Write an enzyme that holds these catalytic residues in place. Structure first.
Site, mmCIF file in Angstrom:
data_model
loop_
_atom_site.group_PDB
_atom_site.id
_atom_site.type_symbol
_atom_site.label_atom_id
_atom_site.label_comp_id
_atom_site.label_asym_id
_atom_site.label_seq_id
_atom_site.Cartn_x
_atom_site.Cartn_y
_atom_site.Cartn_z
ATOM 1 N N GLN A 19 4.745 -0.574 8.415
ATOM 2 C CA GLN A 19 5.034 -0.578 6.983
ATOM 3 C C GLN A 19 5.293 0.824 6.427
ATOM 4 O OE1 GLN A 19 0.889 -2.109 6.252
ATOM 5 N NE2 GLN A 19 1.193 -0.914 4.364
ATOM 6 N N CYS A 25 1.823 -4.341 3.233
ATOM 7 C CA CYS A 25 1.084 -5.103 4.258
ATOM 8 C C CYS A 25 1.257 -6.617 4.095
ATOM 9 C CB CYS A 25 -0.398 -4.715 4.231
ATOM 10 S SG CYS A 25 -1.238 -4.992 2.616
ATOM 11 N N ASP A 114 -3.355 -23.303 2.233
ATOM 12 C CA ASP A 114 -4.523 -22.436 2.126
ATOM 13 C C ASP A 114 -5.673 -23.064 2.927
ATOM 14 O OD1 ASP A 114 -3.483 -20.443 0.432
ATOM 15 O OD2 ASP A 114 -3.856 -21.670 -1.360
ATOM 16 N N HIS A 163 -6.262 -5.914 2.450
ATOM 17 C CA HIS A 163 -5.233 -5.677 3.439
ATOM 18 C C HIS A 163 -4.840 -7.004 4.070
ATOM 19 C CE1 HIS A 163 -2.893 -3.402 6.167
ATOM 20 N NE2 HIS A 163 -3.604 -3.697 7.240
ATOM 21 N N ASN A 187 -1.654 -5.865 13.270
ATOM 22 C CA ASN A 187 -1.508 -5.050 12.063
ATOM 23 C C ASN A 187 -0.041 -4.636 11.917
ATOM 24 O OD1 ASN A 187 -2.368 -3.581 9.765
ATOM 25 N ND2 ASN A 187 -3.722 -2.230 10.938
#
Ligand SMILES: *C(=N)C1(NC(=O)[C@@H]2C[C@@H](S(=O)(=O)c3ccccc3Cl)CN2C(=O)C2(c3ccc(Cl)s3)CC2)CC1
Ligand SMILES: [Cl-]
Length: 220
Positions: A19, A25, A114, A163, A187
């Site tokens: 990023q 993120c 969700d 994050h 990540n």
């Protein structure tokens, strides 16, 4: 369920991205989840445009290089009727006017799911669905300077996640010691960070760092 899962082994996951100097993120988490579900659908792995999300998903609630939510990104793709490829709409690491072009759309989504705030529910989703977008508390020097092993931070919060990342599996480390399980997390800080850009986040340790607090994935 399997004792370990790694969706990379089935072709669901693009290489690690970076990023850079933008707070995007959330966009990388969202494109990772949508890359996986598009692959589940079509058998084709196509890298998707984070820049399209950064530049265009303000009306859904995102704030560009200053943060956003994966669910807002999924809502954008649905509202917009598409998302451009990484190739057609390359990453710039700065928020610009929206340049979405429907000619180059390569993904769609019909909604999002969700997952409830339960590590067992997250495990079932990871075992069956594919890579899952998750929120974590990354707000500790220990995370910034993580290199290897199972990440465990006693001060981690299960509510103050900050994050967005991508769970691509789970597993365990061989040991007689208590608490040897982890989530395999991709990540968006490049391969120079962590274990080639991945982190093994402690699993089944009281929802460590909030990894099951705001987990979701797109429907396609
Ligand atoms: C990424 N580079 C940065 N982080 C964010 O944009 C994160 C991503 C989500 S979260 O923290 O994963 C999250 C928290 C709680 C529930 C769901 C989620 Cl997905 C949000 N976020 C933030 O920094 C927030 C925002 C909340 C709404 C927004 Cl719009 S931005 C402050 C929490 C450093 C930018
Ligand atoms: Cl950031």
């Amino acid at each position: 369920a399997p004792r370990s899962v790694d969706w990379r082994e089935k072709g669901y996951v693009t290489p690690v991205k970076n990023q850079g100097q933008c707070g995007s993120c959330w966009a990388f988490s969202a494109t990772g989840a949508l890359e996986g579900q598009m692959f589940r659908k079509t058998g084709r792995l196509i890298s998707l445009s984070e820049q399209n999300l950064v530049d265009c998903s303000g009306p859904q609630g995102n704030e560009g290089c200053n943060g956003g939510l994966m669910d807002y990104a999924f809502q954008y793709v649905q509202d917009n009727g598409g998302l451009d490829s990484e190739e057609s709409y390359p990453y710039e690491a700065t928020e610009e006017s929206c340049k979405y072009n429907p000619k180059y759309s390569v993904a769609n989504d019909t909604g999002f799911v969700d997952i409830p705030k339960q590590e067992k529910a997250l495990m079932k989703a990871v075992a069956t669905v594919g890579p899952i977008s998750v929120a974590i508390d990354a707000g500790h020097e220990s995370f910034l300077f993580y290199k290897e092993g199972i990440y465990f931070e006693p001060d981690c919060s299960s509510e103050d996640m900050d994050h967005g990342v991508l769970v691509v599996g789970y597993g365990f480390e061989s040991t007689e010691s208590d608490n040897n399980k982890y989530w395999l997390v991709k990540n968006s800080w490049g391969e120079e960070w962590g274990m080639g850009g991945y982190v093994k986040m402690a699993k089944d340790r009281r929802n460590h760092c909030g990894i099951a607090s705001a987990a979701s994935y797109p429907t396609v």
